Amino acid sequence: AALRPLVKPKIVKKRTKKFIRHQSDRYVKIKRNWRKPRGIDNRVRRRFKGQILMPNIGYGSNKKTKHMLPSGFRKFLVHNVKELEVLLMCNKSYCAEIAHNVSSKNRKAIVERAAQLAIRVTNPNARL
Amino acid sequence: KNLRIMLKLNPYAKTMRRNTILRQARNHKLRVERAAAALAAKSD
Amino acid sequence: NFAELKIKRLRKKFAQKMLRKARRKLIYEKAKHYHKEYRQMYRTEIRMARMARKAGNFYVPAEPKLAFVIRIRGINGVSPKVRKVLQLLRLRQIFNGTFVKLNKASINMLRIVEPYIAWGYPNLKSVNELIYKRGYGKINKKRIALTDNTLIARSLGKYNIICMEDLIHEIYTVGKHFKEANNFLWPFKLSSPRGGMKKKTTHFVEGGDAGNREDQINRLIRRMN
Amino acid sequence: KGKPHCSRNPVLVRGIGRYSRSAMYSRKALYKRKYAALATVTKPVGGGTRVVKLRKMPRYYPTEDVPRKLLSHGKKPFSQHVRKLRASITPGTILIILTGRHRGKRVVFLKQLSSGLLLVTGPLSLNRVPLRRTHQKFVIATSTKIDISGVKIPKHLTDAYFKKKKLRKPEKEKYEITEQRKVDQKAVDSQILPKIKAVPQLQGYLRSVFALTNGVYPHKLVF
Amino acid sequence: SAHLQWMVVRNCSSFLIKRNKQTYSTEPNNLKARNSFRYNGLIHRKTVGVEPAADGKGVVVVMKRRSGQRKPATSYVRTTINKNARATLSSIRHMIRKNKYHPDLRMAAIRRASAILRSQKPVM
Amino acid sequence: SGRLWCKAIFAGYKRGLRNQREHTALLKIEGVYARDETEFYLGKRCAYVYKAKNNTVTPGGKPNKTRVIWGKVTRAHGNSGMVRAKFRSNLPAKAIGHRIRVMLYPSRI
RNA sequence: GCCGUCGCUGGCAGUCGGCAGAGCGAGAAAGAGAGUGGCGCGGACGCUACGCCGCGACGAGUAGGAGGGCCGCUGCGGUG
RNA sequence: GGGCCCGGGGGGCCACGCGUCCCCCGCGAGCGCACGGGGUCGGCGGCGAUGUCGGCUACCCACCCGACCCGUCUUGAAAC
Ligand SMILES: [Mg+2]
Ligand SMILES: [Mg+2]
Ligand SMILES: [Mg+2]
Ligand SMILES: [Mg+2]
Ligand SMILES: [Mg+2]
Ligand SMILES: [Mg+2]
Ligand SMILES: [Mg+2]
Ligand SMILES: [Mg+2]
Ligand SMILES: [Mg+2]
Ligand SMILES: [Mg+2]
Ligand SMILES: [Mg+2]
C-alpha cells in the first residue's frame, strides 16, 4: 500500500558480492576496503585464475537502473521540511531519507509533510 | 531467411522464387506421371 | 490562402512516390538481366568444354579473376612482412574475410601470407550469401548493415551501383569499379568453422587448411557464413 | 460500392501468390477499371441553454508521465493467434493426461476449442474424467482411435463454458457441479460410450492408468 | 541579461543543492525546483510561480510584471485561485497561453498546481 | 497410479578439465546410451527433487518438506546419450550422482 | 545484452501554437521563395547547452605519463 | 549460343489512354492482410495471518571446480 514509482523496471546487477581486498582475510590490519594491488609478483594483480577479483569499469551498472533502490525510487537525504519540498515535482522517481542526526521531534513534521505531498520516506518509523 | 526483407533489397527475388516453386512442382508431377506409366507398362 | 500551398505539397509528394516507383522497376529489371547474364556465363563454359571434347581437344577455362581470402591464424607472433600484408588485405582479425581481384601484384602478396590465410575461388552462391547475411558497408567510416538499398546507392551510386544486385554483380564479375565496391564493403566477420578444421598449421594440399584450396573455399564459406 | 470478391491470387506459399503482377492485372480487368482524380452537445436548461462539452479536461495531472511506445507489428492479442494441433491428435484419439489430478488417465479426444485447448471426455463412467479442457503439450497421443465421426457435440461447449468461475472468500467456497454440466455429460457420453464398447477390451483400457515401470523407456515404445 | 546571470549562478548560488547525484534549486518561482536555465525563477524577465495559499485552500499564481525588473518590491504579481480542481487549472492554462507568458512553462505550472491541490485534500 | 518420469542421474557440470560451468548440468538418462536416442528428451522438463528441514508450501497441496529445482533438457551431449540441462538455479554439488526426474511434457509426440 | 573509452572536431537554441499549422534521411548542388503582366480555445517530455541525444569501432599491462573523482582527512572565506 | 533470345510466314510479361510529328517497319479515392524501421497477449492457473511468502549481499555450515605468501631486488621468487 506504499507509494509506487512511475515505472519499476528490472534491476540487473553484474555483481552483488563486495570486492574484498587482497589478503584482508589473513590479517586484521588489512581492512576489506578495496586497494589496487601493485606488487611485482602479485598474483591477484596479474589476474590468475581462481584468485580474488579486481573491480573494473566493466562491472558498471546500467545507467537506467543505477542508484535505483529496490523499491524503484532514488533516495535524497533531507534535513528539514524545507529541503523536503524540492521533491514535490519528482515524487514518482525520488524518495526522501531523513538524516540520522534529525531529532525525533523534527522527524514527525517531516514524516507528516511527506505524507501530504505523496513523497515516499525510506525511514518513516525511526526514532518514534 | 526473411522473405519480405529480401524483396526490399532485390524485388526480383519474388519472381525467381515463384518460378522455382512452380517449376519444381511441375517437374515433380512429371516424374510421378512418368513413373506410373512405366509401372502400368510393367503390369502389362 | 493555404489550399494552393497544400496542392504544391501533395504534388511534390506524388513526384517523390513516382521517382521511387520508377527506381524500383530499374533495380527489379537489373536483377532480371543479371540472372540471364549469370545463366549465359554458366552455360557458356559448359558449351565451350563440350565442343573441345567433341573435337578431341582440351578447353582450358580462364584463370579465376576473384578470390575470397580468410584469415585462419591469430595475431600473436607475426613477422613484420606478413603483418603488413595482412593489414593491406584488411584481414586484421582471425576469421576475417575479403574479396581480392587476382593479378600478378595480388597473387604474390597472397603467397607471402600463405601460412596465415585460407583462400580460393568463390562461386556465385558464395558471393550472394556472404553479402546478404554478412554484408556491411563502410559509410562515413562506420560499419553499417546493408539493410536498405539507399545505403548502397548514396555511396556507390556514382558508379551506377545502386542495389545489392549491382553490388553482387560488381564483385562477382570483377567489374570496372570492383576496387570501390569492394573497399566499400567492410571486411566480412565470419564465425568459427562449424565442424572444425583439419590442421590450420599446414597447407591445404598437406591435409591442413592454409593456402589456396581453389573452389574448395566454398565448402569452408558455408560452414563459416 | 461492390461486393467483396475472393482473392484472385491463390496462395502458392506464405507471402507469395500464384500469379505475377501482370497476370493479376488481366485477371482483375484493371485495363478497363481505370479511375481519375462532434465535440459539443447543446441542451436546454431551466439562460435557456448551455453548450455542453462532451469530454472534460483532466482535473488532475501527475507530476510525471511516461512517453508513448514505438509502433511494432505482428504482436497480435491471444484471441487472434492461429491455433495449431499435432497431426497425431485426431478426433476420437485416445490421449494420456500427464498433469493435474487426472494424470495418467486415458481419455477420448473430442475437438479443439477456439483457444487451442483440447476438449476431452473420460467418459465419466470409465475413469471419472468429465467433459474437460486440456492442453495438447501436456498429453501423449496414442495410436488407438475410435470413429466419433457421427457424434454430435453440443455447440455451446466453448472455452467460455469451461472457464472457471471465480469464488470469493472473506469461510471457503466449494465448486458445485451445475445441472447443465451433468446433462451435457450424458448427452455426449451416451453417444461415445457405445462406440468405445465396440472395440473389444477398449473400455478396460480406459479404466487403467499409464505408468512407467522397470526397464520401460518412453523413447523406445510406441503409443 | 538572463544568459549572463545564468553563467554566474549555474554552479554558485545559495539556492543550489547538490546531493545524492541530484541537483535542485530552492528559489521561488521555480516550477520544478530544478537547477535549470528554463526553470530558474530569478534570471528571466518573465517568470511563473505556483504556491499554496497561506491557508491550505487554493494556489497563488505569481507572474513577474514587465517594468520593474530592478525593483523587487513591485516586481511580482500574486493571484489567489481557490476554485475547484478543473477550474483552477483552466485559469492557469489561460493566464499563460492567452497572454503568451512563458508558454513553455504551461504544463509545469499545471502539473505543480495539481500537486499542490492534491496535497490539500484530507490525508488518508 | 505409477511413476510418470524417467530416471536420470546428475552426472556433473559442464566443464573442460580445469574449468567448471555450473550453469549447465550433464544428465545421464536410464536406457539412453546413444546420441540418437536423446531426441525424444530434448526440451523435456527436469526436476531435482529433495527434502529440507523447514516446511514449504506445495502447489495444490499443504506445506511439507519437499522442494524442487526445475529445469529442462536443452541439447544432447557426446555420443552416448548424455544431455545438457539448465535449471532455474544452478544445482548444488551435493546432488551429483543422485536422482534427477525427467518428465514426459512438453509432449511432442 | 550492459559498462566505459575513442571517433563521427556527429544532432538539439525549432518549446518558431488560434499574431498556430507541425517537413528538411534523402541515391545523384541550389527555394516546402516573393509578388508583376500575358460548434470547441486544446495540443506529453525536453534545454543543470559544463546539458541532453544518436551512430560506429574498440577495451592486456610492469617502469612511467595523463585525466576524472557527488573518493576520504584537517583548517579558512562564503552559503545552507 | 548472341543479337531488348534478328527477321519473315500450352504458358509467363515490373505490356495495357491517346492525339499526333516521327527513327524503324506530374495529385483518384478508400478499405484490409502482413516473413515489412528490436514483444506482446484485447491469455490463464495456484497459495496466503501463526505458519507461511520474499530478502542479491551479509552470519554459520556443506559440497563441486579453482586456488602456493605478501613486499622487494631480480633474466627468473611459493622458494632452501
Ligand atoms: Mg615479475
Ligand atoms: Mg604462437
Ligand atoms: Mg556441433
Ligand atoms: Mg609455428
Ligand atoms: Mg587498459
Ligand atoms: Mg583441485
Ligand atoms: Mg591446497
Ligand atoms: Mg629486495
Ligand atoms: Mg640472481
Ligand atoms: Mg615475491
Ligand atoms: Mg628452491
Swiss-Prot record, chain A:
Q: What does this protein do?
A: Component of the large ribosomal subunit. The ribosome is a large ribonucleoprotein complex responsible for the synthesis of proteins in the cell.
Chain positions found as Phosphoserine:
61
UniProt modified residues of type N6-succinyllysine: 49
Give the multimer and partner information: Component of the large ribosomal subunit.
What is any one GO biological process for this UniProt entry?
Answer: translation
For this protein, the record's CDD domains field holds:
Ribosomal_L32_L32e
**UniProt entry keywords in alphabetical sequence:** Cytoplasm, Isopeptide bond, Phosphoprotein, Ribonucleoprotein, Ribosomal protein, Ubl conjugation
Cross-link Glycyl lysine isopeptide (Lys-Gly) (interchain with G-Cter in SUMO2) placement: 8
Q: Where in the cell is it found?
A: Cytoplasm
> Quick check: keyword Translocase in the entry?
no
Q: What is its main location?
A: cytoplasm
List the GO terms this entry assigns under cellular component, sorted alphabetically. Answer: cytosolic large ribosomal subunit
Q: Which family does it belong to?
A: Belongs to the eukaryotic ribosomal protein eL32 family.
This protein is called what? Large ribosomal subunit protein eL32
Write down the SUPFAM superfamilies for this protein, in alphabetical order: Ribosomal protein L32e
GO molecular-function terms, A-Z: structural constituent of ribosome
UniProt-listed InterPro entries: Ribosomal_eL32, Ribosomal_eL32_CS, Ribosomal_eL32_sf
From Swiss-Prot, chain D:
Q: Which InterPro entries match?
A: 60S_ribosomal_eL6, Rib_uL2_dom2, Ribosomal_eL6_CS, Ribosomal_eL6_KOW, Ribosomal_uL6_N, Translation_prot_SH3-like_sf
> Keywords on this record?
Acetylation, Cytoplasm, Endoplasmic reticulum, Isopeptide bond, Phosphoprotein, Ribonucleoprotein, Ribosomal protein, Ubl conjugation
The portions of this protein that span the membrane are none
Phosphoserine: residues carrying this PTM: 72
Q: Does the keyword Ubl conjugation apply?
A: yes
Question: In which compartments does the protein localize?
Answer: Cytoplasm, Cytosol; Cytoplasm; Rough endoplasmic reticulum
Q: Give the record's GO biological process terms.
A: cytoplasmic translation; ribosomal large subunit assembly
Q: Does the keyword Cytoplasm apply?
A: yes
Q: Which PROSITE patterns match?
A: RIBOSOMAL_L6E
Describe its assembly. Answer: Component of the large ribosomal subunit. May bind IPO9 with low affinity.
What Pfam families would the database entry show?
Answer: Ribosomal_L6e (PF01159), Ribosomal_L6e_N (PF03868)
Main localization of the protein described in the UniProt heading: cytoplasm
Give the protein family: Belongs to the eukaryotic ribosomal protein eL6 family.
Q: Which residues carry this modification: N6-acetyllysine?
A: 174
Record protein name field: Large ribosomal subunit protein eL6
Organism taxonomic ancestry: Eukaryota, Metazoa, Chordata, Craniata, Vertebrata
Name a GO CC annotation attached to this entry. Answer: rough endoplasmic reticulum
**Cited function:** Component of the large ribosomal subunit. The ribosome is a large ribonucleoprotein complex responsible for the synthesis of proteins in the cell.
Tell me the domain of life: Eukaryota
Q: Name one GO molecular function term.
A: structural constituent of ribosome
Which positions does the record annotate as the modified residue N6-succinyllysine? 43, 152
Curated annotation (Swiss-Prot), chain E:
Arranged from A to Z, the UniProt key words for this protein are: Acetylation, Cytoplasm, Isopeptide bond, Phosphoprotein, Ribonucleoprotein, Ribosomal protein, Ubl conjugation
Residue numbers of Phosphoserine PTMs: 114
State if Acetylation is listed as a keyword.
yes
One record GO biological process: translation
Q: Name one GO molecular function term.
A: structural constituent of ribosome
Q: Where in the cell is it found?
A: Cytoplasm
One Pfam short name = Ribosomal_L28e
Q: Is Nucleotide-binding among the key words of this record?
A: no
- Provide the protein name: Large ribosomal subunit protein eL28
Q: Which organism is it from?
A: Oryctolagus cuniculus (Rabbit)
Q: What is the lineage of its organism?
A: Eukaryota, Metazoa, Chordata, Craniata, Vertebrata
From Swiss-Prot, chain F:
Name of this chain's protein? Large ribosomal subunit protein eL33
> In which domain of life is the source organism classified?
Eukaryota
Q: Which PANTHER family match?
A: 60S RIBOSOMAL PROTEIN L35A
What is the annotated role of this protein in its UniProt record?
Answer: Component of the large ribosomal subunit. The ribosome is a large ribonucleoprotein complex responsible for the synthesis of proteins in the cell. Required for the proliferation and viability of hematopoietic cells.
What keywords tag this UniProt record? Answer: Acetylation, Cytoplasm, Ribonucleoprotein, Ribosomal protein, RNA-binding, tRNA-binding
Please name the GO terms of the biological process aspect recorded for this protein, alphabetically.
Answer: translation
GO (cellular component) term, any one? synapse
Organism, scientific name: Oryctolagus cuniculus
InterPro entries according to UniProt? Ribosomal_eL33, Ribosomal_eL33_CS, Ribosomal_eL33_sf, Transl_B-barrel_sf
What gene does this protein come from?
A: RPL35A
What molecular functions are annotated in GO for this chain? Answer: structural constituent of ribosome; tRNA binding
